[PDB]
């Protein structure tokens, strides 16, 4: 009789998606990335800074 | 005593009056649609009177109910009144206009005995 909106009403959110419980448990909305030591070549930077 | 009902909504408590019933006496106030080719009322220009239409209709739960919450039922005698013996919380009696004073006494007495509400318990009373 009434459309309850997920993205509020955690109960309807969990009715639709059971993964929403562990998404919040692991904080997958704030996942950190593995650091990387990659550096661009000189051609990329000199072409970018070219006039 | 009335049956529980919602708040009664009307959506137009003002009587729809004919265009120019205020301007000409020959033009009565009973609603007539304007059927004219250049009628501002037919064309619904801003600032004109409102026309009756079905969106103004009353809720079917609160239709035909008086503010007391009863539906009016005309009666001319105790036999017509007794039809509302088991319907006192829904229907209220209205004594007809052409009923005599001495019979109004009987109808009101029987209605008080049976618990029936009467909308006009003052017509043709002397004192």
């Amino acid at each position: 009789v009434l459309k309850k909106n997920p993205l509020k009403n955690k109960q309807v959110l969990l009715r639709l998606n059971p993964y929403a419980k562990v998404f919040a448990a692991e904080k997958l909305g704030s996942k950190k990335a593995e650091k990387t030591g990659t550096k661009p070549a000189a051609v990329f930077t000199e072409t970018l800074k070219h006039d | 005593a009335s049956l529980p009902h919602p708040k009664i909504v009307k959506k137009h408590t003002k009587k729809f009056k004919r265009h120019h019933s205020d301007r000409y006496h020959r033009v009565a106030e009973n609603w007539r649609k304007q059927k004219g080719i250049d009628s501002v009322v037919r064309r619904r220009f801003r600032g004109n009177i409102s026309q009756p239409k079905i969106g103004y209709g009353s809720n079917k739960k609160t239709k035909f109910l008086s503010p007391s919450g009863h539906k009016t039922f005309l009666v001319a005698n105790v036999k017509d009144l007794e039809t509302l013996t088991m319907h006192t919380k829904t229907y209220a009696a209205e004594i007809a206009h052409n009923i005599s004073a001495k019979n109004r006494v009987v109808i009101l007495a029987r209605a008080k005995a049976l618990g029936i509400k009467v909308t006009n318990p003052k017509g043709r009373l002397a004192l």
Binding site: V43, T47, H50, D51 | -
Partner: protein, 159 residues
């Protein structure tokens, strides 16, 4: 006065061609037309017999009859709010096979070949054509292809 005749407004349409006047090559007469064949209509102006009305120039129809020198073609013609079927008796000089049907039937037999080939192993042919999809990822190298920078040029007269 007005003028709406049979060959009205046909000046350039029933023109023959540039450097292709004269008689018609014999392939037009050696071609073979069976009932159900799809044919396009293009009137030759040098053969005045068996011509189509200008309406049917560039129209494609289906053969319904075959005679000594002519061919019976069915066409669909818009007349107001509907289509009417029209029967023309056209000499074959004004008639050539449509290549669309040949290119469809080649695909028909190719799809049949693919289906028979891949039913021996059940690998979900997916024979339907598909539109041109978006192009996939790729990598572009600058080895010998360093970017060449450009700039808008000023205004000059050039006269």
């Amino acid at each position: 006065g007005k003028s709406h005749g049979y060959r009205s407004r046909t000046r350039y349409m029933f023109q023959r061609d540039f450097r292709k006047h004269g008689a018609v090559h014999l392939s037009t007469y050696l071609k073979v037309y069976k009932v159900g064949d799809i044919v396009d209509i293009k009137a030759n102006g040098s053969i005045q017999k068996g011509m189509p009305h200008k309406f049917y120039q560039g129209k494609t129809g289906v053969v319904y009859n075959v005679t000594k020198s002519s061919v019976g073609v069915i066409i669909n013609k818009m007349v107001g709010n509907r289509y009417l079927e029209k029967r023309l008796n056209l000499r074959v000089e004004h008639i050539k096979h449509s290549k669309c049907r040949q290119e469809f039937l080649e695909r028909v037999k190719a799809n049949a070949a693919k289906r028979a080939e891949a039913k021996a192993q059940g690998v979900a042919v997916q024979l339907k054509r598909q539109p041109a999809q978006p192009r996939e990822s790729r990598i572009v190298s600058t080895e010998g292809n360093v970017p060449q920078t450009l700039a808008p040029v000023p205004y000059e007269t050039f006269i």
